[PDB]
Amino acid sequence: VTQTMKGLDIQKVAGTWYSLAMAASDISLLDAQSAPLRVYVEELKPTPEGDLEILFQKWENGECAQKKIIAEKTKIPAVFKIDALNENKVLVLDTDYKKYLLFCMENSLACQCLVRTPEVDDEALEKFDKALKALPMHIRLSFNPTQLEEQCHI
């Protein structure tokens, strides 16, 4: 991935978001309620040091678990690191802070269209599909306003 947000201000992504849409390189990354990159974002909390804590839900062991991860900053403002068995990158592609944010997680790849409200944002989906045009995605999911107001988008 070689789309990053030039000039990103990480403090301005703070707050409420909805996972409107998701996509991944491999079907198995999103196909089941319990698939590993089926993660629903709740809230971003930038630290004063400029790390980004992520609140999200994950369907786990037949139910909707509350989860909390922190992505550590790098020399590149639009690029964060999650420590695990593998070195995994979080990239911010594009945001306008007040309506949408596009990002990817990569080691292979999953991306999302975040929005501030439980509404279908045709414009934000256009920009998302445009950004995926380049990437080798084999599954795409989108959610309706009813699902967006439910735990794990049921």
Ligand X SMILES: CCCCNc1ccc(C(=O)OCCN(C)C)cc1
Q: Which residues bind ligand X (CB under 6 A)?
A: 39, 41, 54, 56, 69, 82, 84, 88, 90, 92, 101, 103, 105
User: Which stretch, 11-19, 60-68, 69-77, 138-146, contacts a second copy (CB under 8 A)?
Assistant: 138-146
Closest CA to 11 of 53, 45, 42, 56: 45
For residue 30, the minimal CB distance to a second copy (Å) is 8
Q: Please give the radius of gyration of the chain, using alpha carbons only, rounded to the nearest integer.
A: 14
User: Which stretch, 7-15, 26-34, 65-73, 91-99, contacts a second copy (CB under 8 A)?
Assistant: 26-34
For the record, the structure tokens of 61 come out as: 């062991």
What is the CB neighbour count within 10 angstroms for residue 124? Answer: 23
Work out which of 31, 43, 60, 96 binds a second copy, going by CB under 8 A.
31
Give me the count of residues in the chain.
Answer: 154
Gap between the Cα atoms of 55 and 153, Å rounded: 15
Pattern 83-122, a second copy, x by CB under 8 A: ----------------------------------------
- Is residue 145 helix, strand or coil? helix
For the record, the structure tokens of 31 come out as: 């196909």
Smaller CB distance to a second copy: residue 41 or 52? 41
* C-alpha 58 chain-centroid distance: 13
For residue 12, the minimal CB distance to ligand X (Å) is 12
